[PDB]
Design a protein around this motif. Structure first.
Motif, short mmCIF file in Angstrom:
data_model
loop_
_atom_site.label_atom_id
_atom_site.label_comp_id
_atom_site.label_asym_id
_atom_site.label_seq_id
_atom_site.Cartn_x
_atom_site.Cartn_y
_atom_site.Cartn_z
N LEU D 51 0.83 -1.21 0.00
CA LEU D 51 0.00 0.00 0.00
C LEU D 51 0.87 1.26 0.00
CD1 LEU D 51 -2.13 2.18 0.99
CD2 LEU D 51 -1.86 1.17 3.24
N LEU D 52 1.96 1.20 0.76
CA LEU D 52 2.90 2.31 0.87
C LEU D 52 3.49 2.53 -0.50
CD1 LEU D 52 2.86 3.40 3.54
CD2 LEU D 52 4.80 2.00 4.25
N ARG D 53 3.89 1.44 -1.14
CA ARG D 53 4.46 1.49 -2.48
C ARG D 53 3.40 1.95 -3.49
NH1 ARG D 53 7.84 -4.00 -1.31
NH2 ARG D 53 9.50 -2.91 -0.14
N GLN D 54 2.26 1.27 -3.47
CA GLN D 54 1.14 1.59 -4.36
C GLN D 54 0.92 3.09 -4.54
OE1 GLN D 54 -2.18 -1.26 -4.36
NE2 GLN D 54 -1.40 -0.92 -6.45
N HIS D 55 0.85 3.83 -3.44
CA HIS D 55 0.64 5.26 -3.53
C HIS D 55 1.94 6.04 -3.64
CE1 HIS D 55 -2.87 3.34 -2.23
NE2 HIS D 55 -3.54 4.41 -1.85
N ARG D 154 -10.69 14.32 19.44
CA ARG D 154 -10.74 15.26 18.33
C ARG D 154 -9.46 16.07 18.21
NH1 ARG D 154 -16.97 15.46 17.89
NH2 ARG D 154 -17.32 15.26 20.15
N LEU D 155 -8.91 16.47 19.35
CA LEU D 155 -7.68 17.24 19.34
C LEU D 155 -6.58 16.36 18.80
CD1 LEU D 155 -6.34 19.78 19.77
CD2 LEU D 155 -5.70 19.12 22.06
N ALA D 156 -6.52 15.13 19.30
CA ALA D 156 -5.54 14.16 18.85
C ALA D 156 -5.61 13.91 17.34
CB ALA D 156 -5.73 12.86 19.59
N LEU D 157 -6.81 13.65 16.82
CA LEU D 157 -7.01 13.39 15.39
C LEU D 157 -6.76 14.63 14.52
CD1 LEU D 157 -7.55 10.55 15.50
CD2 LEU D 157 -9.85 11.19 16.25
N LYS D 158 -7.08 15.81 15.03
CA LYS D 158 -6.87 17.03 14.25
C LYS D 158 -5.38 17.19 14.06
CE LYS D 158 -5.96 20.93 15.34
NZ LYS D 158 -5.01 21.59 14.37
N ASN D 159 -4.67 17.15 15.18
CA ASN D 159 -3.23 17.28 15.20
C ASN D 159 -2.60 16.24 14.27
OD1 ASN D 159 -2.24 18.41 18.56
ND2 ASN D 159 -3.73 19.22 17.09
N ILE D 160 -2.98 14.98 14.48
CA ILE D 160 -2.44 13.88 13.70
C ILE D 160 -2.77 13.97 12.21
CG2 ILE D 160 -2.59 11.38 13.33
CD1 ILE D 160 -2.80 11.16 16.47
N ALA D 161 -3.91 14.57 11.88
CA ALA D 161 -4.30 14.72 10.48
C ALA D 161 -3.50 15.86 9.87
CB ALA D 161 -5.78 15.00 10.37
N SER D 162 -3.26 16.89 10.68
CA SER D 162 -2.50 18.06 10.25
C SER D 162 -1.09 17.68 9.82
CB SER D 162 -2.41 19.07 11.40
OG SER D 162 -1.41 18.69 12.33
N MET D 163 -0.66 16.49 10.23
CA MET D 163 0.67 16.00 9.91
C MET D 163 0.70 15.30 8.55
SD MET D 163 2.06 16.89 12.87
CE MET D 163 3.38 17.97 12.36
N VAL D 164 -0.40 15.35 7.82
CA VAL D 164 -0.46 14.69 6.52
C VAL D 164 -0.42 15.71 5.38
CG1 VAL D 164 -1.86 13.23 5.03
CG2 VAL D 164 -1.72 12.72 7.46
N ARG D 165 0.51 15.50 4.44
CA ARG D 165 0.66 16.40 3.30
C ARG D 165 -0.51 16.18 2.37
NH1 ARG D 165 1.85 14.11 -1.95
NH2 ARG D 165 2.08 11.97 -1.12
N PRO D 166 -0.98 17.24 1.70
CA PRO D 166 -2.11 17.08 0.78
C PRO D 166 -1.78 15.92 -0.15
CG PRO D 166 -1.58 19.38 1.02
CD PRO D 166 -0.50 18.63 1.74
N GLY D 167 -2.76 15.06 -0.41
CA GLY D 167 -2.50 13.91 -1.26
C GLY D 167 -1.79 12.88 -0.41
N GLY D 168 -1.59 13.24 0.86
CA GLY D 168 -0.92 12.36 1.79
C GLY D 168 -1.90 11.34 2.33
N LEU D 169 -1.36 10.29 2.93
CA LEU D 169 -2.14 9.20 3.49
C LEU D 169 -2.09 9.14 5.02
CD1 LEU D 169 -2.81 7.76 0.84
CD2 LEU D 169 -1.56 5.77 1.72
#
Lengths: 292, 292, 292, 292
Positions: D51-55, D154-169
């Motif tokens: 999956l890591l490779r796939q994307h 929610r704070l945890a997920l917001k923060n953790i999502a903020s760590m994803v680059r657009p088009g990121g996984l």
């Protein structure tokens, strides 16, 4: 190798100083909580006395004495009352009342002893047994089931029954845990015996161990009047736990307590209860009748 | 963010079930300790009575009641006794005896209340104040000094002194701490009031906070007879803490509790005491006298 | 039968969440306390290095690593340093520093392991032994004597000595507890090794069990800069304990550690120390020398 | 007015002596548990890698590092990995392995920091954000909801999502709690990532606060081999708590952490998942995709 030296051993006292957590902000409320005791329900008064008289039993045993309000009304009502309880923290309130009214023959003949449903056998001389034994106020639910097999339940029950004279009566109740377990909530303002003039808030916590419910915990947030800024009240909180007893489980439990030689009957809130009943009782009062 | 959910609030009870730490193996011993010293000393009986008689004071106040073994003798001796204490785990025993003998006029007239030295004023009504006020048994050493300025010791003594009628007497005591502080040991078998018949062992721990003795902690290992295999004794232990009161210290402390308007005396175990004395007292009994 | 269900077992972790009391207001200060570490004393630098060189020992063993400041200076100074400590809470700070400077050959050859003075024997391969073993910062005083007979002391010592190559040196110190025990105070600002740029306040608590001193407890009230309203600092507090080691006791203790085949010598603060010395040392550094 | 003097502040260490609860008999097992599951699953290796490779995402971030067994494989697989965690008792093990293999270029380039989901923003610099972000192992279920409004989830997920680059996984997971909530049991041997080889026993305790499932507590009794008499195993136990995350619940939760601007998917144990599915998943793996 660590350490945490504590001043006084746990469960020991010293004269001149208050008992350990005796004056905690949680002990204070529970105190003025177990005190909201007085404002008893007519329905309750008219039911217990009438049931008591209707079967002409005079020698009553209260195995869940407590502050002693149930028993004080029996004392006033003329029955031969012997009150017992395992909490010396509670009993202290019964004895206080007695002392005051010791001048009254009745109150002087009132017997307040100490005892555990698990040692009751060798805690109170039965002899012939008693005409009637009462354990109201959902008090049997206080005793938990550590071993998970409810072995202590059967014992507490077994013992309490042996206190019942052949022909004697056993009036034992429990809260509608079927309902609280199903809904997951045990709200304030349902007590049928004594109208609590104290506003409250309750958070119900239900614990299930390996799918089997094991305990219901109640976190109370009482609105103490006057404990506020300008007339405003205060909000202290205390915590108590009970064993979620289902009507079905209890019915058979309480029954094997007599070994079958009994006569069972379950009351709705105070009225007769028949399954599928349109009305959901807030309490389940079991009145037994020993054969011999 | 953690958690530690506990069954019951600290300091609250439930009917039917014993109180929180009421039955630990530490409470069981402490129980047969606060009770297994009672075999009053002839020297004690004779000294207190005589002194009480000598000054002709009749309305006595025991501000350190406890199990009541003290008051029970004044009662028995016709004194107009009123016994108080802060610990309910203790009074329970004085009222347990009183009720037992309520059928005795003197005992019936026995007042057993609940009160704290720091609140004694609005806890017990004096009006005219009592003739005498005892606080024997080294009970005052139970109250500690958290603040470190013994502000409470002073509050306690002020309150307790305020309970003495002018020309009234005060009999407050303490152990010879000038001695245990120096040997660093507080061995058993030194009660001059009641000769215990209990085999005990005690490890003494002294805590000096910033060169100042702040507390004495006694870890007692009681040799409970029979509590073993073949009649052999068992070994249970509890702990208790005290405040090291040095003679000079206390002498001026209890005095300022009278604003100076007093008459102070201090005796040996029972005989009179003078500094440098040949005989080493095991207890220091101060006997004050309010002027007006 | 009671209960107090706690969320997580004590001493276990879960990823995603901080370790138990790792971020308590007391852990925070102690953290920024063990960090005041860096501002080492010239006297200390010039003494250890000169002593180290003067005897031409190159292979050094630090058995009280900690954050790793003593060892970092040895690493920089070219010795073959292997640092060990029993606290993974402390060690974490040494490894952090190492990693950063891993690019530096020296720091890469730096050995930071984990070990207890009581298992040191089977915790660190000695082989030929080490040229020099250091245990500075009054760190040996952290290990308490539960059994009262100092059996673990002799072991910790025995072991640490076995890490010393014949001809090797043992530089082990302790605070002047004779003085603190006598005065009853251990004030801040005496540390000879690292100048603490942190203002503090310390309350000394001395505990004696059956006349024998057993422990010295220090309650620190650190003035954390910036943790205040408008530039003002904050005041957090933490607590640590040590065993009051007297020069005499230690001298012989550390000696039997080599079984006598040693060469003892005690330094004042850093200067030679001779009894009756006009100057009261704030620390007592023992430098031993194994025979074989 | 009481007291309970403890040796060391909670959460502080001293050099030379092990950390507070580091060696309880509960920590010893938990230790051989957080480590005795590591025997990675071929299905796991192959799925994640693929999956890591796939994307084609290369700069990965493991916000639930732990002992690092996850990252160690991405590392080994050439990924630009940076592994974080809040618990230092856990990371200690990732850095213990990294150092071990620091002599490997990839490993050397391995970033192992310390961070908390609720502070991830100013804890780890993203700048452009990572291509991928894994949080497998059901680590998110460790963080609880004290407030009761899961504001932290929610704070945890917001923060953790903020760590994803657009088009990121984002690859965050959880156990099938819809199932254990219903059976009321969470048996062992269900890790799809690492096949433990440890014989375990687990008592499941579910707490519903006001009809709402609030926590799952696992009391594990590990059968530690040999830790008994003649090779016989010993039985040690620790406890751990989690937050019961139901599928519907989480699905919308993790989503709002992206403000909707995402692409959500959820698979079975590893295969794709659809409601009502015949096969019951043991873990629910959400794999999101940031738009911009």
């Amino acid at each position: 190798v660590d350490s945490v030296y504590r001043t006084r051993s746990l469960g020991v006292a010293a004269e001149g100083i208050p008992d350990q957590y005796a004056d905690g902000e949680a002990a204070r409320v529970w105190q003025l909580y177990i005190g909201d005791t007085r404002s008893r329900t007519a329905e309750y008064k008219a039911w217990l006395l009438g049931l008591l008289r209707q079967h002409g039993c005079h020698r009553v045993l209260d195995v869940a004495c407590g502050t002693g309000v149930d028993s004080i009304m029996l004392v006033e009502e003329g029955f031969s009352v012997t009150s017992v309880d395992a909490s010396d923290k509670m009993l202290k309130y019964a004895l206080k009342e007695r002392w005051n009214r010791r001048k009254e023959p009745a109150f002087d003949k009132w017997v307040i002893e100490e005892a555990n449903w698990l040692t009751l056998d060798k805690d109170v001389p039965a002899g012939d047994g008693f005409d009637a034994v009462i354990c109201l106020g959902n008090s049997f639910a206080h005793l938990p089931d550590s071993k998970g097999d409810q072995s202590e339940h059967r014992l507490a029950l077994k013992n309490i029954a042996s206190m019942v004279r052949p022909g004697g009566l056993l009036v034992i109740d429990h809260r509608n845990y079927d309902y609280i377990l199903s809904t997951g909530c045990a709200p304030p303002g349902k007590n049928i015996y004594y109208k609590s003039d104290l506003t409250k808030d309750i958070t119900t916590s239900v614990l299930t161990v390996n799918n089997k419910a094991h305990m219901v915990t109640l976190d109370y947030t009482v609105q103490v009047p006057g404990a506020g800024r300008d007339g405003a009240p205060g909000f202290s909180k205390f915590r108590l736990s009970y064993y979620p007893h289902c009507l079905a489980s209890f019915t058979e439990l309480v029954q094997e307590a007599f070994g079958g030689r009994c006569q069972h009957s379950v009351l709705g809130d105070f009225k007769p209860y028949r399954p599928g009943q349109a009305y959901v009782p807030c309490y389940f009062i079991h009145v037994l009748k020993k054969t011999g």
